[PDB]
Amino acid sequence: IAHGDGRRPNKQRQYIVMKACNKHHIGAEIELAAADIELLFAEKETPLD
Amino acid sequence: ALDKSIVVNLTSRLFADELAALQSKIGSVLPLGDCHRLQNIQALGLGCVCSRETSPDYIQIMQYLSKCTLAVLEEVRPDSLRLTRMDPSDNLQIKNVYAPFFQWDSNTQLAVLPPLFSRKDSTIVLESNGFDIVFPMVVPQQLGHAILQQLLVYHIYSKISAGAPGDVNMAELDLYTTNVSFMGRTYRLDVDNTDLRVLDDLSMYLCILSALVPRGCLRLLTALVRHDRHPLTEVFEGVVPDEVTRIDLDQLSVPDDITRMRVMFSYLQSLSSIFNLGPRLHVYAYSAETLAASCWYSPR
């Protein structure tokens, strides 16, 4: 404000504002037992399997 | 229309440790023995006169001060220093980076005094080029014409104790000299109980004056009778001490007194100019959070 009084008038002003980001994390979990994965590779030897 | 800049070159680069000591300031007051813009390093300090192996002095600095030209930093590139020339009656900007710290104010008088304290406060050794730059001691004039005041007292009583022990008490001398009072504030300074030597040469003079001076005034009194004898000089018998006026001319003949009087005033004029002709300025605007002292150079 340019006001005509005895209050000490001030020049131009300028601010510098400076951010920063964050990091976040997710961790899941899976049920796999090797008795399942064992029979993933053998096949055909009976119509049961 | 005119342009001014002073660019000092170096032979080599600098260490990265020294640049932090020369970004401690970015605007300060350098003396400079040249007026031209391309220049080797050997003049911008006070190492043109004041060095370690030399006997450090006050007067041979002070004679060199008023002859010298000031210049103000703007930038420290890793190779070359950039300066701004200090014209007569020119306005420019200072940052008050000096040691030991004193607080400034707008509308103070400023005398450029030579440093006389410990080395680490004033100088910065440039380890690259082997040359010492010395910064002058920017003190305001009311302080600068009183910071010398009690220190010069302190050097005189030190010479008394080292020849005669039972005459000066150290607790009296320490308490009254190194605690300079100003503004309502105090400033305790560095006493130098490390072993002084900057300020023998005034005390070399001022005592050898102070015996010659009262002996010199008796001959000046009884050698003036006219009716042009100035009317105030009748009064000043009441000022001169009574023991001073009890001296004959018996001990000193006529050829001895010439070696007094032709030499008497030769001290005083060598002495009066080194209390007065500091290259002096004034400061009209100041802010402690920015530390922006504000010169205008009065050549003097």
Binding site: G4, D5, G6, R7, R8 | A1, L2, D3, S89, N91, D105, S106, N107, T108, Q109, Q141, Q142, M183, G184, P231, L232, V235, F236, G238, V239, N276, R280, H282, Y284, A285, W296, S298
Partner: protein, 321 residues
């Protein structure tokens, strides 16, 4: 509405400091055609005209002093002014952030406490500006003891003339001027000269033909004499005006303050106090042009001098004796 701002592009871009004259070499020998004010002797003719010497006045020397922006109470500094006074800057301790105390010379008479007929003119006038000489003495309780040891002449930094004063209820803004010729405010292009009361000035120039040469310079000084009246300490102020060099005036001031030296130093037969021995100081207040006539004025009556074309230049308080 940019037609308003198109005027701002005129005045700002025209009123700049002159740039550093610098030319790259691939243009060639053209640099000297940008050298104008280094000339002096222009082109006369038979009947010259504004159209023949508009170039001769287009060049102009570069002159501007710098100002001192102050914040004053409405008590030390009077609401009325003649706008061209003289100032000081009292200096004790930085209490406020921007809280400054100023002294006009008409005020500083009342701060002293001297006789009436030693300065008979302003004493009637300086009694209606301020109180009984005690509204200001409440601000410094050392005005007896600043007089004793001789520290008051150390605590005055003169400033010079005035330029502007916007006045409010308690706080007064004072735009002062050092270094030269302050541009005026209420009258544009005018130049606020320095004004002195006719009582406080004492000339040194004036003589009967009886001869001394002219020059460019004549220098207003500023005396300050510690006297003692009624066995109470009180200062004394006068002015000077003489284009005569520093070696002469110190030998001439002592003839003017002869009796003041003669009164006080009779008293030191029975006593001596080393703080009392200091007597006076002389500052340099700047330069005045030669043979510029000080035009007398009058204010409610108070005869007030003026100096056109005064330029300011301060100095140290060199003690004399």
């Amino acid at each position: 509405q940019a037609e308003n701002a198109a005027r701002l592009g005129r005045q700002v871009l025209g009123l700049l400091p002159p740039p550093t004259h610098r030319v790259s070499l691939t243009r060639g020998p053209e640099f000297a055609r940008g050298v104008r004010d280094l000339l002096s002797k222009y082109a006369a003719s038979t009947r010259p005209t504004v159209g023949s010497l508009h170039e001769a006045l287009r060049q102009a020397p570069f002159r501007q002093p710098t100002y001192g922006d102050f914040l004053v109470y409405s008590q030390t500094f009077s609401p009325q002014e003649p706008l061209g006074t003289f100032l000081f800057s009292f200096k004790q301790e930085d209490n406020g952030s921007s809280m400054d105390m100023l002294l006009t010379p008409t005020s500083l008479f009342m701060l002293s406490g001297m006789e009436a007929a030693k300065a008979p003119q302003t004493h009637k006038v300086a009694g209606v500006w301020y109180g009984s000489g005690s509204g200001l003495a409440d601000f410094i309780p050392n005005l007896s003891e600043l007089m004793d040891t001789g520290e008051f002449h150390t605590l005055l930094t003169p400033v010079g003339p005035m330029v502007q004063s916007v006045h409010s209820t308690f706080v007064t803004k004072v735009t002062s001027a050092m270094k030269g010729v302050g541009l005026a405010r209420d009258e544009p292009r005018a130049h606020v000269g320095l004004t002195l009361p006719c009582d406080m000035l004492v000339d040194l120039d004036e003589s009967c033909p009886m001869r001394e040469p002219a020059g460019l310079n004549v220098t207003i000084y500023a005396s300050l004499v510690y006297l003692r009246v009624n066995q109470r300490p009180s200062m004394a102020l006068t002015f000077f005006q003489s284009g005569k060099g520093f070696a002469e005036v110190v030998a001439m001031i002592k003839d003017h303050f002869t009796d003041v030296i003669r009164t006080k130093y009779i008293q030191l037969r029975h006593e001596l106090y080393i703080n009392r021995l200091v007597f006076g100081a002389v500052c340099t207040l700047g330069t005045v042009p030669f043979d510029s006539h000080p035009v007398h004025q009058s204010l409610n009556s108070l005869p007030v001098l003026v100096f056109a074309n005064f330029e300011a230049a301060c100095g140290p308080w060199t003690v004399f004796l």
